[PDB]
């Protein structure tokens, strides 16, 4: 359901975590409240893996994973990929990408069926995405903002975009993603909605200073 937390004192939960339908990744920053905001509302259907990729605690901006695969950038090492492989269900495939745009969670906005991709991605990348995730792509900007994975949080049930999204563009996004959206905000008005919060098909974690009208329109559309 709806959950607030903070990583250390920041409300950008999607920066420090990557939640999906099969697993959930978090960073190592203490904060038993931040860990319990997952593991208190989670059964053991999904494993909560603690990892840093390329030494960075910003793992939710540099991984772009699905329910059936995980994309780590070229900067990750062998040891923190082995730690991912030895603690994750084998229905996914941890493929390390080698292309230019290193912030994969920033340039990729994917759920279990469709993937919205930043336009200047390499032509070798989207076919690899459709190989490891079984998912077709759409190389279109949310609203001129070419960073589609941080200005749009997306699940199978609903979507959510930043409030500069034109009404003519929400139609195109809903027709290509086959999913209704809403132009909303998060964390007292932060327009970086794909990074201010993380989502599942049954759990939506939000930053701590979010408001009740923000959580109402998050939980209204992300459950259906």
């Amino acid at each position: 359901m709806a959950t607030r937390t903070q990583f250390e004192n920041s409300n950008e939960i999607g920066v420090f975590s990557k939640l999906t339908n099969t697993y959930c990744l978090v960073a190592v920053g203490g904060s038993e409240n931040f860990y319990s905001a997952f593991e208190a509302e989670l059964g053991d259907a999904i494993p909560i893996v603690h990892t840093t990729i390329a030494g960075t605690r910003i793992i939710g901006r540099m991984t772009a994973g699905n329910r059936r695969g995980l994309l780590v950038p070229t900067q990750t090492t062998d040891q923190e990929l082995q730690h991912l492989r030895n603690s994750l269900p084998d229905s996914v495939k941890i493929q390390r990408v080698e292309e230019r745009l290193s912030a994969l969670g920033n340039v990729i906005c994917c759920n279990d069926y469709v993937a919205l991709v930043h336009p200047d991605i390499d032509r070798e990348t989207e076919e690899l995405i459709s190989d490891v995730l079984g998912v077709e792509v759409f190389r279109q900007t949310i609203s001129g903002n070419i960073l589609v994975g941080s200005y749009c949080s997306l699940s199978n049930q609903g979507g959510l975009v930043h409030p500069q999204t034109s009404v003519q563009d929400q139609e195109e996004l809903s027709s290509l993603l086959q999913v209704p959206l809403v132009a909303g905000t998060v964390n007292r008005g932060s327009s970086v909605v794909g990074a201010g919060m993380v989502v599942n098909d049954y759990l939506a974690v939000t930053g701590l200073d979010t408001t009740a009208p923000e959580l109402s329109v998050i939980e209204s559309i992300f459950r259906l």
Binding site: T77, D78, R100, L101
Partner: protein, 60 residues
């Protein structure tokens, strides 16, 4: 631990030796020493620089 390669010459860069250089077109270069780094700065071509791996592979 991982060993890497010089980008100009093709020498095995060991950890703690050489430099890195992140170009403005978002390409990353490794240099084993200041000779290879300065030959990259002077716009030289590793296919012309005779002692690299590229010269020996192009000249077979």
């Amino acid at each position: 631990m991982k060993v890497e390669i010089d980008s100009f010459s093709g020498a095995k860069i060991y950890p703690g030796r050489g430099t890195l250089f992140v170009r403005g077109d978002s390409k990353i270069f490794r240099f084993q020493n200041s000779k290879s780094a300065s030959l990259f700065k002077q716009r030289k071509n590793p296919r012309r620089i005779a002692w690299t791996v590229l010269f020996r592979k192009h000249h077979k």
